[model samples]
Target: TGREILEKLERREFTREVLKEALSINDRGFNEALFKLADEIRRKYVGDEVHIRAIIEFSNVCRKNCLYCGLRRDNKNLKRYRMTPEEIVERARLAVQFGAKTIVLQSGEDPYXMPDVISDIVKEIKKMGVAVTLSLGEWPREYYEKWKEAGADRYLLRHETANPVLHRKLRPDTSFENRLNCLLTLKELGYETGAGSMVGLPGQTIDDLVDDLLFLKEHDFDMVGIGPFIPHPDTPLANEKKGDFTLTLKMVALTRILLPDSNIPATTAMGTIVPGGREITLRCGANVIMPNWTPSPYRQLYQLYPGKICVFEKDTACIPCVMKMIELLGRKPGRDWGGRKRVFET
Candidate 1:
């Protein structure tokens, strides 16, 4: 029965109702079967290489106050810092030396960095022959074009939640429509665009989760990042319970089944939620692991949520750790630029 449901999903015959049923899966045996199918699909489409994109969270400074993020401007308890452009380039160099083919430069919506500043950084990192992915929140269309011209290869902008009302309520500064428009603009500019959502936010229903999946499938994002919502102590949602781990796993599995070739990361937030979380996710359709390359003190300061893993380790410590994790799972570390392989579609 589970196989039949998944076959319908594979055939692109799934309606919202069908997707809801799949997401609401509760039986242990059925969930295992579904994860198995997702793992098989991942192997068939993306193969055994797990791509490691080293992420450098250069800044925690933000102009917007999102209810869920510790980096939100209202969080006075959080110490914010922005790395100099030269320091940022140096970090990228170290990441390349440590064997990351993709350098993901991530930060909050810090306007001080400026468009030209980012464009120059992208240009410099591209000189190292590694792919660059910018996750510096929403920016002007012109800025995206400028960076693309400077040789950036990818962009990641998670919608955070699919419920438009919830999205507007959480992120008071930007509208849900505007967020999607930025993603579209990135795709139009020829970047491998990524779109993702949090699995369990307060007031988010299962239907919202289903809509999140449908949104990813409809957009055909080159990369997808789904993770549990871990609450931060200084944020408005601080007292809220964390996202369910098993449910988050189901979301990852369903995403893999739906977008067979989309590069999906076993997100760091997953590791924060449970022990061996990333390993479990790798078995359930995830093939990318973004090891943090952000330097000390700042890496600790860039916490979007509390209890984040790898915060205390040195910047150089994560690669060896993640490499061993990949090897332990019997998967090879990806060597080339880990862009999404576009072989399967549904």
Candidate 2:
């Protein structure tokens, strides 16, 4: 059965059934073969350039209370802070100076800062000869349009998971219809849309993962961020076991096979879970590194999950380290704005 699944993967015959079998992989020989196959597919389709996105966690204030996040509004132990637009622009400038050609302005869903403020920030960053990406969560469609007009190049809104029961249980304050609507809105508005899932969530099944991969394929995502779900000590799922790191890598590899042209970042959470985790992911299929460049004191407070790697590190420390890792893996650091070049263009 594993051999049959491998055969299907080689032919690019990706379907729900084929992915189900691929996810069922257990034998050592078949698993090794699977990784090899994924690497080859990655080389043939996406090539060897690893794109770097310097993520600035500009704000830690969130409105919705997600059960797993350390920054959830109800988490009274966490301190809240927001960077001034001027400070944010300066950080973007520094990120570009340090060789990150793309700047990701990430924040929790805080409403205090209006759309006008975000638009100004986007305008400022785009002027620095670097592409800008936003990950501030769900907002009115008008806000999405406002940012798009302000020259925001991309947006990342992880779907988290596709299973309705799991999704509702984890994000009780959020609705599935509303979240999907937000992604559909982003697609319509011409943003390079990104959606992703966590691999080892509590009560998640193999079939749920199959659905996640298939969902990305069906939706035709331009970027996908898959990482292991490491629980936060301050959250409801604090006592749960961490997701399997090896399985998370397998999901990343499979995603490359399915969405061959999408940007797949070897997430920071991966590094938090295991030693040299991000490097292992680069070999597997991940072609991007979203290193945290959030300045020392602020970075520590913006924790989505506990034990976030490189929280206290400065931009100077993070950028050079990631670039060296890319070179060590024999992968080129991307030189230009690394947006998704769609399949037709490829």
Candidate 3:
């Protein structure tokens, strides 16, 4: 019976409900079979090129109290810092020199990081012939439009969790509907919009995971990032059980089966879960790896979760190390603008 669903997945004939049932698989054989086929489909559609986007944590000052994040406003034990616009542009240059085709500027929701400052950074990075991706949190439509006008190409705003109750409890300052609207607005503003969710969060159910996948499909997200919920020591989730690691990997494989050609990053959080999780994700269906390109000194300061991978490595060392990992995985590192491939058009 389950094999029929696996066969349907291979034929790309499964509906959202069928995919949800696949997400509920408890048998190891069925899960492996599904993951195996997803890998084959990934190979056919995206090849073995691992798109590496260098990420700089440009700021650590957030105004929101996201309960799981170390940069949350309530966390006073952490030191806050912000990189100047020129410094951000210079870091982008260093990323390009280290062979990155894309520069991802990420930060907590800092109001002082004005739209004009971000626009300037985007402009400088675009001039370097690299794609600019911004992960600064939710803002007004005008702010998103401003950056788009300044040549920013992609925006990553993770919906966090699909369960409205969980989302509300996790982020006291935001609502699930508002989070989704932000993503839709980004798409309307001509961005390669991306949204991701965490696996195994406290009170999160498998049905919620199913909803997360359907949300990505229904919303036409250009890119998807999936990672396990690793708790931070200073956050409210510190006492809760960590998210199931294998389930997160399964989600990555399932996303590949569902979305086919959408870009998926073998998230650093995956590597944090296990020493070799990132490589395993590449074999499963992931085709992207975002290595830390944040400055050496500030890397440790930008902790979203404790025990983050590569928080101490310098850019010079981190770059070559990632290239070596790419080579070791039998996947060639991507060298050009890693734009989202338009594989779903009619």
Candidate 4:
């Protein structure tokens, strides 16, 4: 349904007038159109089961300093801690207890977080009969395969910004080509690969978003995880401007339409911006919610966007509340993160 709907958006019909409508639709007639469209998409793909991905900010140790992140390269001001394998499983078990079927291990690129280290934790989590996902950035190909063999089911590697020039500014040491290659490699290894860019980072615009959509289309990705670019006071781009909320909704809506079967997530940062933002995203076509299962102490350490609503408060059950909000908004949540490799829904 959204596959055709996003084609409508791509046709340039989402004019200034339509954008104006999208902006005010939450209240009046425009909201009616959104409601109908959102209702059908939710009804067809998701039958009221919220796909919750429990996130544990495994470590705050990062080798590269991202301008918008609180944990910058060697930021002495930030508290850095790496979780032991036991500690990782402990959090995953806690997540399962809270209704999470999948555990996402998120961290900055600390060279010490070897693939083997992650593989050990993956095996432990799988023993509990729950699948594991990793967001540890930039690893050797062998390690990626190792983790996959170890039973890690998915991986998230946001391109951050698909704009090569802007990517250079944010993560100067890394190349967009290399990052994309890694994603491709992950796909080749039979991992459900995810890639996305921030809507509002320094020097981002509508055109940049268009490029990002085109990139995702080109890759035919199974999973697309994107979020608004909120600034962190500790990072170099602390004073930098972030993404527009309305445009963020448009992108999420468009993604739902463009990749109707993909595992698109309503990021936690979006929810932090507004109580119902995540629910709105689900209505717009996003089908996943990432809840923080990281221990309270380390959760705040991997603050990509400070004061993010659920994570800062450690609301692991936020997914249920999101589901309730969606039902109220006339939509249903879905089960599974969509990365069925053979099914390739992610």
Native-vs-model 2 lDDT? 0.88
Cα lDDT for residue 186, model 2? Answer: 99
Clashing pairs in 1: none
The local distance difference test score of each candidate is 0.91, 0.88, 0.88, 0.72
Q: After superposition, which runs of candidate 4 have C-alpha atoms over 4 Å from their true positions?
A: 1-39, 311-346
Error of 2 at 104 (Å): 0.1
| Top lDDT prediction, candidate number | 1
Evaluate model 1: give its TM-score.
Answer: 0.97
Candidates 1 and 3: which is better by lDDT? 1
Q: Quick one: RMSD of model 2? A: 1.4
Which TM-score value belongs to model 4?
Answer: 0.85
lDDT of 1: 0.91
TM-score for candidate 3, please give it: 0.97
Q: Model 4: number of clashes?
A: 4
Q: How many clashing residue pairs appear in each of the predictions shown?
A: 0, 0, 0, 4
What lDDT tens digits, residue by residue, belong to model 3 across residues 125-228?
89998898999998999999999999999999989998999999999999998999899999998999889899989899988998898888788688898999
Candidates 2 and 4 compared by TM-score, better number: 2
Model 1: weakest 10-residue lDDT segment is 337-346
Candidate 2 colliding pairs, count: 0
